[PDB]
Design a protein around this nucleic acid. Structure first.
Length: 155
RNA sequence: UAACUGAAGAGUUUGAUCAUGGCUCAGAUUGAACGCUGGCGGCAGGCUUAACACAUGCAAGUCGAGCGGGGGAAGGUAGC
């Protein structure tokens, strides 16, 4: 099970006579063959936050249907102010995307894809948008089943 | 046979946060200039500014089988 750590940030909370500092961690876990999830964790120390984030990522998982090593069709997704566009590519292209998208795509098992961010580049929001798009991608068999047709009829 | 296949972000407003929004950076390119340094070859390029003023040399001649004159070389013949 491959695990990636997207970002680590230090946050502060104000009390009388000083401030309390903490750490947040965003991580993405996956199997490399269509199962992927992400999570966040808050702690006083960085390793504890990473462990909690990994546990949350393992608890929140979905299944993604791929076409070999690439996407089925172009995808547009959004979450808040972050918008993402993803497009299938031919073999040998690679993963042409930013780090936040790259982590999710590589954990989910995509090898050739072109991706682009618009709007805000906040890591959590970008991961959310990419996750939603991968969740909502469809497939010819599902399309044929829903329309009451055959795969060769659908083309 | 073939004539196309293509898109990455980062820093900075606050005691944290999300958004909006400017500024800055990572690329490619040049008829370039400057600083330090400097062996060779091939192929290219070389006043972007004053359509400012120009010394000097060259950059449009050729035809005697169109024509009349006129020159200077030799040769031959004569004499002394």
């Amino acid at each position: 099970l491959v695990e990636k750590l997207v970002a680590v940030d230090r946050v502060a909370k104000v009390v009388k006579g000083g401030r309390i500092f903490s750490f947040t961690a965003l991580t993405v876990v996956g199997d490399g063959n269509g199962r992927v999830g992400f999570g966040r964790g808050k702690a006083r120390e960085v390793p504890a936050a990473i462990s909690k984030a990994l546990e949350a990522a393992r608890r929140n998982m979905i299944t993604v249907d791929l076409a070999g090593t690439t996407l089925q069709h172009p995808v547009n997704a959004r979450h808040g102010a972050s918008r993402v566009y993803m497009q299938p590519a031919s073999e040998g292209t690679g993963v042409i995307a930013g780090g936040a998208m790259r982590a999710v795509l590589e954990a989910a098992g995509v090898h050739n894809v072109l991706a682009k961010c618009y709007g805000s580049t906040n890591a959590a929001n970008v991961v959310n948008a990419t996750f939603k798009g991968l969740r909502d991608m469809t497939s010819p068999e599902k399309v044929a089943a829903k329309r009451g047709k055959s795969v060769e009829e659908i083309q």
